[PDB]
């Protein structure tokens, strides 16, 4: 198991514009297009992302292309972030995947704010971090995905994904 598969499991694949758990316009593998309520605006962002007039629909390859960009962007974001980078460098390969997942989902900033859990992760207090991570809107809104992510940080294995 790796980051791509992991995220593919958490986000799914949709080739047609859809609304996310928050009600935001999305396409492919969790690619947020816009926070605006307008489908038009969404479609326009989509066309700009793909580089063609899509009319709200894309192919698998297109979706995968957005996905590769998005993962690349997430790692790079962590790496440039002053609060995140150290957390990331302190972790093993599996747990690094867990942190990338949260960032892909909630953005850097979002993640940069679990200040207390970050400290705990850096000190390698797994059980503690997992508890603290659970006290969050994140966990309350997407409890099943969140539990998968937290078990990965707790255990250091891919078990939640098997
Ligand atoms: Cl884009
Ligand atoms: Cl969920």
Curated annotation (Swiss-Prot):
Compartments in which it is found: Host cytoplasm
Effect of residue 117 to F: 10-fold decrease in enzymatic activity
Record note on what altering residue 117 to I does: 500-fold decrease in enzymatic activity
Induction line: Expressed late in the viral replication.
Species for this entry: Enterobacteria phage T4
Pfam family name, one: Phage_lysozyme
Function comment: Endolysin with lysozyme activity that degrades host peptidoglycans and participates with the holin and spanin proteins in the sequential events which lead to the programmed host cell lysis releasing the mature viral particles. Once the holin has permeabilized the host cell membrane, the endolysin can reach the periplasm and break down the peptidoglycan layer.
Domain of life from the UniProt record: Viruses
Gene name per UniProt: E
One GO term (biological process): defense response to bacterium
Effect of residue 20 to E/Q: Loss of 99% of enzymatic activity
Enzyme class: hydrolase
HAMAP family, sorted: ENDOLYSIN_T4 (MF_04110)
Catalytic activity of the protein: Hydrolysis of (1->4)-beta-linkages between N-acetylmuramic acid and N-acetyl-D-glucosamine residues in a peptidoglycan and between N-acetyl-D-glucosamine residues in chitodextrins
Summary of pH dependence: Optimum pH is 7.3.
InterPro entries in UniProt: Endolysin_T4_type (IPR034690), Glyco_hydro_24 (IPR002196), Lysozyme-like_dom_sf (IPR023346), Lysozyme_dom_sf (IPR023347), Phage_lysozyme-like (IPR052619), T4-type_lysozyme (IPR001165)
Record-listed substrate binding positions: 32, 104, 117, 132
Catalytic site: 11, 20
GO CC aspect terms: host cell cytoplasm
GO molecular function, one term: lysozyme activity
Name of the protein described by the UniProt record: Endolysin
Keyword Hydrolase listed: yes
Family: Belongs to the glycosyl hydrolase 24 family.
UniProt keyword list: Antimicrobial, Bacteriolytic enzyme, Cytolysis, Glycosidase, Host cell lysis by virus, Host cytoplasm, Hydrolase, Viral release from host cell
Major location (coarse): host cell
